[PDB]
Amino acid sequence: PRAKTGVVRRRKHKKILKLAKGYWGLRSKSARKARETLFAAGNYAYAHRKRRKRDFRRLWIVRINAACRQHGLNYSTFIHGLKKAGIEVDRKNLADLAVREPQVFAELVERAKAAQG
Amino acid sequence: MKEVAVYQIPVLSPSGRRELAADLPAEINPHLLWEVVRWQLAKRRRGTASTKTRGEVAYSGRKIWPQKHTGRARHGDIGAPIFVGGGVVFGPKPRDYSYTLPKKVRKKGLAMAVADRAREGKLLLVEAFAGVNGKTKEFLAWAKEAGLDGSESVLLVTGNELVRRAARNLPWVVTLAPEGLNVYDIVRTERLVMDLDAWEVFQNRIG
Amino acid sequence: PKMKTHKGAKKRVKITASGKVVAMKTGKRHLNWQKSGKEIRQKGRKFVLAKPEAERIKLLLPY
Amino acid sequence: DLRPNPGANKRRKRVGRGPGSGHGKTATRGHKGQKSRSGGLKDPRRFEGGRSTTLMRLPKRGMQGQVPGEIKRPRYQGVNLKDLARFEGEVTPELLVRAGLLKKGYRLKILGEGEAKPLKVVAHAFSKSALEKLKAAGGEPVLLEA
RNA sequence: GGGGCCUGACUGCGAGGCCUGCAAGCCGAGCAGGGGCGAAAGCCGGGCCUAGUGAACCGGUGGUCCCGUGUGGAAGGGCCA
RNA sequence: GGGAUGACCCCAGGCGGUAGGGGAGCGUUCCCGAUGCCGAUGAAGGCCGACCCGCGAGGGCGGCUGGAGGUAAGGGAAGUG
RNA sequence: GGUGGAGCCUGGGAGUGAGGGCGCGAGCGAUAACGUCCGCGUCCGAGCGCGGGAACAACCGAGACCGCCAGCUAAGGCCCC
RNA sequence: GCUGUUGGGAAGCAGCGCCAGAGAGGGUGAAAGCCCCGUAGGCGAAAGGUGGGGGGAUAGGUGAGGGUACCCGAGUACCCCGUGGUUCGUGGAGCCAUGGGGGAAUCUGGGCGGACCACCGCCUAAGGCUAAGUACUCCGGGUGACCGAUAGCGCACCAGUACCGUGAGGGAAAGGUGAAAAGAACCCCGGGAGGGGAGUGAAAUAGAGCCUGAAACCGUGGGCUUACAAGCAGUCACGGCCCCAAGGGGUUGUGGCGUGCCUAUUGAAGCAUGAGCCGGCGACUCACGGUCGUGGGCGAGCUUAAGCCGUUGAGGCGGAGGCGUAGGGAAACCGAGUCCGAACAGGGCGCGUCCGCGGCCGUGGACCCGAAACCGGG
RNA sequence: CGGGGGGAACCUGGGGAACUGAAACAUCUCAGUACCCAGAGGAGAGGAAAGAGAAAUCGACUCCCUGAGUAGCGGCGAGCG
């Protein structure tokens, strides 16, 4: 018996055209400009997740530095402090203490330079 | 052995009990039964599907355009399988799906098929057929007395052509001469009913 | 549609009961003139190895 | 028995190998990568190089056949008295064809392995050995044929 | 290098290895036949060693337990060289 | 390794990848299953879906269209992506 | 010593038979070439996936099953980008 | 086979029946054994075809010895030369046929049995006819794990047409309203074409190349958004505005990152190949052998082919034959051995089948498309 | 009296290629195939032994299965059979 393509192709194609919503021009309309685009989109996302995880390490650091620069010392030194003090805690994420509750930050700094006389 | 088939009231004489060998629950081999049904339905296949190679298509062999400085793509004749008009590639030809299954494996299957059916409690071989002059009416009445209500499907084998005409048109009964005994027809049916003369030939067909 | 035996081998190599392929030593049909008695003597049959798998496949009906 | 799952047991496998997709046997088709995997190639078995196969080996298997073909000559079939042990009474050709050995293969010759048996045994010949073992009761119907 | 007798520049075999894609190439102790030299122990299956070579096919010679198209022989094959 | 084998849980390794080799699936046409079952209270196909299950191939479910066909489990065949 | 995606044996299926750079050792070349020919090693090939080197197959770091808005390091970096 | 029930429409659903040698299949407003056409089963030819199948009737055929030796197919046999056919390619080359030369006999005749001789045997050449069992499918019919309008024939349709070519020749495209035409009177704008009302219809985004109506492509409206930024067009993050709600959806301002896809290559974003885009068509197969593997059946055995009978989606029978049960040797041969050899040296070789499935191979295009060309007949 | 011309295949006879395969090519192969001509008919051909071939053998011809990829043929190549 004969098994013509039938319905099947139209569907692989509009599965993929759904994924292509909002791409510029033909990238959202062509069965296969969409396709191409989406490989690259896919890789971008994957690596870009990796990066997001480094992109924030970075952000935190820079406002940590900022704030502890406000009390004389700097980030190189400040981390030494926390390290020795045993408070591997901060976790650059959570030195948003820099902003909400600097009170608390102030202390942390003090404890930090105390490990260093 | 577990082997006690079910006599059926020739005249008023109630239901005795015939009993016979590994012809009764021996040990069913599904795979084999399968191989037999498989064989049965392939040999019955027709294989009349055909299609035209590029060679068999009406179009001529003229070369369609130069090959060279056209600016179009290369091509011979318009009968090629990249061409809409053209031939189909490895499309079906007519062929024969039959093959010769080991006779012995057929005996086995046939023997077993009944056995499963005997074990189930479905095999009932009979004698009484006052349901004569093959009228559906007559058979049906007779069936009622034999507890054949038409609530399961039934395979009736017998050499008596009048009882054959009798069922047939019933849609829950599959009618059959004994030489036509075969696993598929056995299996497809829920219940098995045999003439004792039919059970005699079935005997011979094994051993 | 049915393989033919390759007569050129049938004609020059036996198949043993293991299913090893046996051929005469080449190399003494006119060479000679004076090669050692050892040379000319040392031609009875022999095995082959990996190249017999090939030679067997061609003696297909005779097994 | 039921209708479904009479179903093939264990391993039937009719899942043969197709080569067309992104995953499995792709692009160039499940093998091939090159040129002369393309719609024919020379053998091998025998062929190739354009070297000399090994048709440098040589047909000492001389006595290969003359024009009008074979010579009809009466052909002989071996059977061990070992094999005879089975059955008793008297053994003869054709009586044997209706069993494992001889069949049509013409002129019977009993020989060889196993202990002999008390029965007269018609044959076209024996090995010396088998003639001796068959002293333990049994025949010298030999001669035969006309 | 020189002399004496010699023809093992043997026939039938080859444990076992080198080399090695194949097929080739190479070394080989030892046993039998019938020899050579030596009193003997032994040595001899060409040459101090590593080049001087050419698979099969197709033919030619000389042999020969073989085959011989109804039988006997031929014709023509095979086998050894 | 357990072993109330539970294909269910602990223990330890591994899991870039072209030619290739192997292993498990998905889906299309047709066959048995079928004198059956779903269908006008709406089949096939189509247009949406931010919902559900699947690693994925896919499978559902919901709305809209459509207007008459479709076809389980479990098997079988191929003009099968 | 060494249980390793080690080894050995028998069989089915292959692809390859076009390499490239770097380091070291030679030849050719002019102690020229992103030259050319071998040898040992390594990577790219197939790791144009990740970090360094401004950018950059094969130099340095390092072998990417998936996820994290956690942590420690590698090369290389800490005046601003 | 009626009623009832939803529905435009019952054949659905329900109640209660019936026929069945008929429960194949199509149609009827949807899905019906019992409405229609049918099916099972059974009838039928005045006419013209066909017709030993069953009869008849002819033609035709129906002896022994014992003698004569009168006849038993001529440019024939036979031989040589040159060739063909056969498995036979000059081979040791017969047999069958015959272009050329030479050229018999009538059973003591003559051909043959693979050069040739001799035995032994086979057959009667140079005249002719002969059914059946076999092939094929213009045509009628029956079936389908055959196609379903880019498929199936080139042609579902007024196609061997339109069209192309002097000609031979080449050769398309193009199916579908609806149950019923009930195919839209009449009014309105317009020259008409087209609309808008009205109207039919269950439905008119079923309105006439009218079922379904995907994508490319072109519009209209609406949301978010952009005129000091640099780009494989995406992505990760924040923030703004827009739409139903502690959750989403849309959009994108700034920030970080980022060398298209395929092919071919040592190496491609590559300024190397292919590709306007969308849809459909488009490439690893089948037969028979083989060889591995695997699911089974039986086992020193296994298995049947063609056919014959039975079925009418039924299976049986049929052992001719085939592999295996024994090997060695070129062979004669011998045999658990045998070959070389003088050899009680040595050494060489010397322990299943059937069916299914899958990998691979040989023969056929054998994964698909493409030559420049060669040949025959026009 | 007959003939003539037509007919999808199928048949017999008279003539009769090449690409191709042989991994070049001439013998060989494709193949007495394709094609041309003549003829036959529902079929055609063949057909009652101057046969086979080793069997005290069989007994017209045709067709199927075997025999058998055997016997052999063969630049003993490809392959034919």
Interface check for D6 against chain B (CB to CB < 8 A): the answer is yes
| Gap from A5 CA to H210 C1', Å | 28
CA distance B89 to B81: 6
Q: Give the C-alpha distances (Å, rounded to integers) separating B133 from B106, B139, B157.
A: 35, 9, 17
CA distance B187 to D2: 7
- For tokens 């000319």, name the residue: C40
Which of D144, D36, D132 is closest to D81 using CA atoms?
A: D132
- Distance from the Cα of B29 to chain D's closest Cα (Å) equals 9
* Local structure of D129: helix, strand or coil: helix
Edge-to-edge strands, sheet with B123-126: B123-126, B191-195, B154-157, B173-176
List, in sequence order, every residue forming a beta bridge with B176; answer none if it has no partner.
Answer: B157
Interface check for D50 against chain C (CB to CB < 8 A): the answer is no
- Distance from the Cα of B12 to chain D's closest Cα (Å) equals 32
CB contact under 8 A, B34 and D8: yes
Is B105 in contact with B92 (CB distance < 8 Å)? Answer: no
HEC-encoded secondary structure of chain B: CCCCCCCCCCCCCCCCCCCCCCCCCCCCCHHHHHHHHHHHHHHCCCCCCCCCCHHHCCCCCCCCCCCCCCCCCCCCCCCCCCCCCCCCCCCCCCCCCCCCCCHHHHHHHHHHHHHHHHHHCCEEEECCCCCCCCCHHHHHHHHHHCCCCCCCCEEEECCCHHHHHHCCCCCCEEEECHHHCCHHHHHHCCEEEEEHHHHHHHHHHHC
Instruction: Return the ∠ at Cα B132 (arms to B130 and B133), rounded to 5°.
Output: 165
**Position A23, amino acid:** Y
| Gap from A105 CA to H80 C1', Å | 132
CA distance B202 to A72: 107
